[PDB]
Paper text:
[name] ([name]) {also known as TRAF and TNF receptor-associated gene ([name]) or ETS1-associated protein II (EAPII) } is a 5′-tyrosyl DNA phosphodiesterase that can remove the covalently-attached abortive complexes generated by DNA topoisomerase II (TOP2) when it is unable to complete its normal catalytic cycle. Fortunately, this type of DNA lesion is efficiently repaired, in part though the action of [name], which hydrolyses the phosphotyrosyl bond in a magnesium cofactor-dependent reaction, leaving ligatable 5′-phosphate moieties. Consequently, [name] has attracted interest as a target for small molecule inhibitors that might have utility in overcoming innate or acquired resistance to TOP2 poisons. Using a ‘humanized’ mouse [name] expression construct, we have now determined X-ray crystal structures of the catalytic domain of [name] in complex with deazaflavin inhibitors, revealing the unusual molecular interactions underpinning their mode of action.
We therefore created the expression construct m2hTDP2CAT (m2h=mouse-‘to’-human) by mutating the following mouse residues to their human equivalent: E242G, Q278R, Y321C and H323L. We were successful in obtaining diffracting crystals of 148 in complex with m2hTDP2CAT, determining the structure at a resolution of 1.7 Å. In this instance, we also supplemented the purification buffers with manganese chloride (iso-structural with magnesium, but readily discernible in electron density maps) in order to more fully define any interaction of the inhibitors with the metal-dependent catalytic centre of the enzyme. In the 148 complex, the side chains of Arg276 and Asp277 make the same set of interactions with the carbonyl and nitrogen groups of the pyrimido-dione ring, as with 163. However, the side chain of Arg241 occupies a different position, breaking its hydrogen bond interaction with Asp277, and instead packing in a π–π interaction against the face of the tricyclic core of the deazaflavin. Interestingly, the p-hydroxyl group of the R1 substituent in 148, points directly towards the catalytic core of the protein and makes a series of water-mediated contacts to the side chains of Asp272 and Asn274. Electron density maps also clearly showed the position of a tartrate molecule (picked up from the crystallization mother liquor), which is hydrogen-bonded to the side chain of Ser239, as well as an extensive series of water-mediated interactions with several amino acid residues surrounding the catalytic centre. The tartrate molecule also completes the octahedral coordination of the Mn2+ ion (marking the position of the catalytic Mg2+ cofactor). Moreover, its position marks a potentially useful ‘molecular interaction path’ that could be utilized in future iterations of [name] inhibitor compounds.
Numbering used by the authors: 123 to 370
The structure:
């Protein structure tokens, strides 16, 4: 089994940041995931995580401006190695962060990214998605590969990339597209952006590679839906909490 959260925690919002980081660390302590994949981290936010989620090792690649990180629960997850796959044509300092780990006697390749944002950068986001999916297929065959991140995907962008390969699956699709976690960026239900228009999108996604009768998703749920004391949520995104298990 592996449990993890992926969450774009909007470190670029300076308003209520310490309280919101507290909110995120409260969720980490309550759900106690093995791994946390984070996007839109900024330097002060890391400092907060070191004090208030100290039993997670913070793995980063480049830290310029805002960045991703993979948090590994100490004593559960053993760090083996890291690989950074660049997106040569990014205009937003985006890249693919890979961490090989051991957990429960099994080897994992854990991946995250914040793919190119906005509708205007669709074509580059699609190119980056293709890079991510190719990298997932190249991992050694005895490794469980999990991507979890802020893909910024919408509409038919997955199809335009050539589709998910035959051996890669979207965890939400695999569970039958449940409604309760169908949107991860929802401006009707989330008030952190003070914006008039309704938008419900599923930016945050989890892909996993098939390994024929081993780990599969057992649950998927939103996190971050409790308002904090300031009347806002931890992030403008909802996080995703996912567990995979082996069903023989
Ligand atoms: N402000 C605002 C605002 C309001 C409404 C929408 C609605 C959509 C939609 O229906 N489809 C879509 O693909 N993207 C939408 N964005 C969006 C979201 C992030 C983004 O970086 C760029 C556009 C919106 C943004
Ligand atoms: Mn943001």
């Amino acid at each position: 089994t592996i449990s993890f959260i992926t969450w774009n925690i909007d470190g670029l919002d300076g308003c209520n940041l310490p309280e919101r980081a507290r909110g995120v660390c409260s969720c980490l302590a309550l759900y106690s995931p093995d791994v946390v994949f984070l996007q839109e981290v900024i330097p002060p936010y890391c400092a907060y995580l070191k004090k208030r989620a100290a039993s997670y090792t913070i793995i980063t690649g480049n830290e310029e401006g805002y960045f991703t990180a993979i948090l590994l629960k100490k004593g559960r997850v053993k760090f083996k190695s890291q690989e950074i796959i660049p997106f040569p044509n990014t205009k937003m300092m985006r890249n693919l962060l890979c961490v090989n780990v051991s957990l429960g006697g099994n080897e994992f390749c854990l991946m995250t990214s914040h793919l190119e944002s906005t509708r205007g950068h669709s074509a580059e986001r699609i190119r980056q998605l293709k890079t991510v999916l190719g990298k997932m297929q190249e991992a050694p065959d005895s490794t469980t590969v999990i991507f979890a991140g802020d893909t910024n995907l919408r509409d038919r962008e997955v199809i335009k990339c050539g589709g998910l390969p035959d051996n890669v699956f979207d965890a939400w699709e695999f569970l039958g597209k449940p409604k309760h976690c169908q949107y991860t960026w929802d401006t009707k239900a989330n008030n952190n952006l003070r914006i008039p228009a309704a938008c419900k999108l599923r930016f945050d996604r989890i892909f996993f590679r098939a390994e024929e009768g081993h780990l599969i998703p057992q649950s998927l749920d939103l996190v971050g839906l409790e308002k904090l004391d300031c009347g806002r949520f931890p992030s403008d995104h909802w996080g995703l909490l996912c567990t995979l298990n082996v069903v023989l």
